[PDB]
Paper text:
The protein at the heart of both T3SS secretion and secretion specificity belongs to the SctV/FlhA family (injectisome and flagellar system names respectively). While only injectisome members have been given unified Sct names, the SctV/FlhA family is conserved across all T3SSs of both flagella and injectisomes, which assembles early into the inner membrane, and is central to T3SS assembly and function. The ~75 kDa SctV is composed of an N-terminal transmembrane domain functioning as a proton-protein antiporter export gate, and a C-terminal cytoplasmic domain (SctVC) implicated in funneling selected substrates to the export gate. SctVC’s substrate specificity is mediated by a trimeric “gatekeeper” complex formed of SctW (in SPI-2, SsaL) and a heterodimeric chaperone (in SPI-2, SsaM and SpiC, lacking unified Sct nomenclature).
Numbering used by the authors: 345 to 672
The structure:
């Protein structure tokens, strides 16, 4: 008893909406998260609250980040879809999306528009999943990279045994973290390990190895952003900002970080945020030698905002320059 080591993931439910064949739903949820994003997740212990408040809490390493109260009338949960039908709209914490509760007739009407709607137990799964995608970078450390590299040795022994003698594990783990953080799938381990073996002796910076590994997954990146090959509602950055960041980066040579002028950071942030309010959804483009720093700036907010570059863009990808930036 009193063993050290917190519990990874645990779900607290009121017994009014419990054991409605929830186990199968959460299984089928994680068995799909795995093949969607590669990271394998741990089992989900479920706790029963002797409570009347019909509440649910999802505790992450014995510390809470999601807790919601479901009204009695709630049913036929819809999640952040179009405003065609509005039964009851709601906003989630930390900007994790918006939900909407629907009536049966409104649910059928929504289904008519080709959307999807959940009811019964599957609403719990579709909400838990929405919670997890926001916190996928938590389940990748020095101890899970080892599990992946031990699973591989079944069929790729001579590849991992050759990757090991080029990098220490505490850099492979960092690279995988930097990748899965930006919602880039890592299910193709063969290609990542190959690209890491190629460039390892020529470079000792994980922050650069990540960029090189990122260039090589153009198909696996674009196929997800732009199904059926539609033109990209892109944006662009201003040459002044590009140059400013360019000289700021070299301000330090060893740490490889950029000296920050808040009297430029703040303006860049506000100007970008205002520009996105024009409904230019995603696909901010930038120079190759700055994308990492640009994402470093934004990650504090506006998460789920892709920051691509020209190298990740195919020679014949269909483009529409919808906006441009003037600050300098």
């Amino acid at each position: 008893s009193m063993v050290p080591g917190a519990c990874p993931l645990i779900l607290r439910l009121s017994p009014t909406l419990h054991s409605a064949d929830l186990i199968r739903d959460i299984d089928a949820m994680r068995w799909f998260l795995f093949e969607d994003t590669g990271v394998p997740l741990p089992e989900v212990n479920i706790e029963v609250l002797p409570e009347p408040t019909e509440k649910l809490t999802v505790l992450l390493y014995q510390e809470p980040v999601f807790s919601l109260s479901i009204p009695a009338q709630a049913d036929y949960l819809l999640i952040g879809a179009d405003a065609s039908v509005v039964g009851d709209s709601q906003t989630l914490p930390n900007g994790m999306g918006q939900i909407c509760w629907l009536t049966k007739d409104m649910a059928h009407k929504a289904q008519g528009f080709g959307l999807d709607v959940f009811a019964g137990s599957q609403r719990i799964s579709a909400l838990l999943k929405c919670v997890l995608l926001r916190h996928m970078g938590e389940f990748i450390g020095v101890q899970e990279t080892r599990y992946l590299m031990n699973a591989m040795e079944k069929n790729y022994s001579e590849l991992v045994k050759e990757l090991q003698r080029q990098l220490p594990i505490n850099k492979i783990a960092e690279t995988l973290q930097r990748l899965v953080s930006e919602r880039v799938s890592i299910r193709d381990l063969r290609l990542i390990f190959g690209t890491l073996i190629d460039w390892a002796p020529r470079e000792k910076d994980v922050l650069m190895l990540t960029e090189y590994v990122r260039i090589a997954l153009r198909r696996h990146i674009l196929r997800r952003l732009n199904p059926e090959g539609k033109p990209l509602p892109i944006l662009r950055i201003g040459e002044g900002i590009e140059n400013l960041v360019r000289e700021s980066i070299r301000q330090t040579a060893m740490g490889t970080y950029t000296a920050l002028s808040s009297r430029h950071k703040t303006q860049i942030l506000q100007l970008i945020e205002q520009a996105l309010k024009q409904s230019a959804k995603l696909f901010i483009v930038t120079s190759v030698d700055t994308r990492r720093f640009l994402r470093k700036i934004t990650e504090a907010t506006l998460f789920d905002v892709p920051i691509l570059s020209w190298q990740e863009l195919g020679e014949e990808s269909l483009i529409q320059v919808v906006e441009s930036i003037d600050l300098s």
